[PDB]
Amino acid sequence: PKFEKNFYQEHPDLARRTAQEVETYRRSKEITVRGHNCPKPVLNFYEANFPANVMDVIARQNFTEPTAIQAQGWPVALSGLDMVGVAQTGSGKTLSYLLPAIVHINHQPFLERGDGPICLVLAPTRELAQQVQQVAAEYCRACRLKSTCIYGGAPKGPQIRDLERGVEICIATPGRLIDFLECGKTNLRRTTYLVLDEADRMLDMGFEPQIRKIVDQIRPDRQTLMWSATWPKEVRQLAEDFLKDYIHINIGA
């Protein structure tokens, strides 16, 4: 269904401070933006038009302020823009792409039986996979969203069933997902939102081909977000093959 919307976020007028009042925030957070039409960061969760349900889960978590990563990374994802986020491995990036993912999923029909994931997140390892799943569980459990991990280090039964009972979000390690794809355990026919975390680690672990096989099975018109700690030639190439007119944000020099 070549009919699909990733919107634009519209910054509440309350976010109207165009003067270099922002360069102060960015140079203050070590943020470095490189792209066409790069929106201003959101300083207050409210300036980011999130759904009742989500914003609720935040206060619950007792958050001080939206990190450099989310302050600058939410508006871009909410606008349907592609982007490369370069931050320190381990940083709080999960919630940056996670939340626009939820919003993204909502302006879309429910999940038909047989329909695979909408939002796909590729991680280099099992550590990271669960880590994303534990940051997300709380927001999925707080909405109509089913999430699930899938790595080659646990019983394939729980995973295949999780997918049989259909989830809107899938977090996976390359090789793992691949084995579930060639078998009819699931499919990326419904995926429009692709995230790739710690792709610097993913390339060094020799996952590049499995990754390619995967993305080469996704609507080239999908929204793609990539996160890397380092920006070698290997991540740029990957970025050019996957992304297009993407925003390039930097926080970890």
Side-chain angles (χ1 to χ4, degrees):
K2 285 54 108 182
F3 324 103
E4 162 230 333
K5 293 281 264 195
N6 47 345
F7 355 117
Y8 59 106
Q9 138 250 32
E10 202 63 85
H11 33 341
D13 305 299
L14 54 79
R16 178 57 182 59
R17 52 236 166 183
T18 307
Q20 304 196 310
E21 322 158 59
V22 180
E23 317 200 323
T24 312
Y25 179 76
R26 289 182 182 168
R27 289 188 177 66
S28 145
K29 310 310 173 192
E30 303 181 68
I31 300 180
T32 296
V33 158
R34 300 194 163 188
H36 295 151
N37 276 299
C38 182
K40 319 172 193 173
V42 294
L43 311 162
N44 295 287
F45 311 74
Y46 314 76
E47 329 187 318
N49 196 41
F50 284 152
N53 311 178
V54 178
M55 307 202 82
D56 196 318
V57 189
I58 307 175
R60 298 180 175 179
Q61 202 56 295
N62 253 37
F63 278 162
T64 165
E65 289 176 309
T67 318
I69 285 174
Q70 351 182 306
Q72 179 58 90
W74 281 331
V76 166
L78 299 169
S79 300
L81 305 176
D82 281 22
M83 68 140 239
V84 158
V86 166
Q88 216 188 303
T89 293
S91 304
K93 309 160 291 180
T94 291
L95 226 58
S96 274
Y97 53 78
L98 175 55
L99 307 195
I102 284 168
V103 186
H104 183 90
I105 291 174
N106 293 8
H107 303 212
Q108 261 182 53
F110 289 8
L111 224 59
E112 298 244 293
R113 197 172 65 75
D115 272 319
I118 298 172
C119 163
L120 174 71
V121 168
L122 291 173
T125 71
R126 183 172 67 120
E127 300 76 284
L128 187 62
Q130 274 169 55
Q131 178 39 47
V132 175
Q133 186 73 61
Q134 293 181 304
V135 184
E138 199 166 330
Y139 290 80
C140 302
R141 168 188 59 60
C143 188
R144 70 170 183 73
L145 312 185
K146 308 176 185 176
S147 191
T148 184
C149 285
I150 161 203
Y151 39 65
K156 297 184 184 179
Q159 308 180 322
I160 59 180
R161 76 220 302 151
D162 241 321
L163 301 172
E164 295 189 306
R165 285 176 272 227
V167 297
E168 281 87 358
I169 291 169
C170 176
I171 297 165
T173 58
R176 185 51 155 208
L177 181 59
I178 295 288
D179 295 308
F180 279 173
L181 290 182
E182 257 159 55
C183 305
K185 301 317 173 196
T186 191
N187 71 81
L188 315 190
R189 289 192 310 275
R190 195 83 149 61
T191 310
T192 55
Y193 191 89
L194 165 65
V195 172
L196 300 115
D197 223 350
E198 322 206 313
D200 59 310
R201 298 194 52 187
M202 303 209 263
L203 286 168
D204 296 323
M205 298 173 96
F207 285 158
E208 160 157 38
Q210 292 87 69
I211 286 167
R212 280 182 180 291
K213 165 176 274 182
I214 289 157
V215 182
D216 257 30
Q217 275 179 50
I218 304 176
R219 306 180 171 164
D221 60 317
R222 80 265 162 173
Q223 171 166 38
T224 312
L225 307 175
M226 179 171 57
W227 280 91
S228 192
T230 57
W231 187 244
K233 174 182 181 171
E234 289 225 306
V235 300
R236 301 199 203 214
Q237 52 159 65
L238 202 63
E240 312 201 326
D241 305 344
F242 293 173
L243 304 176
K244 38 201 174 71
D245 190 57
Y246 65 81
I247 295 300
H248 178 73
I249 53 175
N250 193 94
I251 300 187

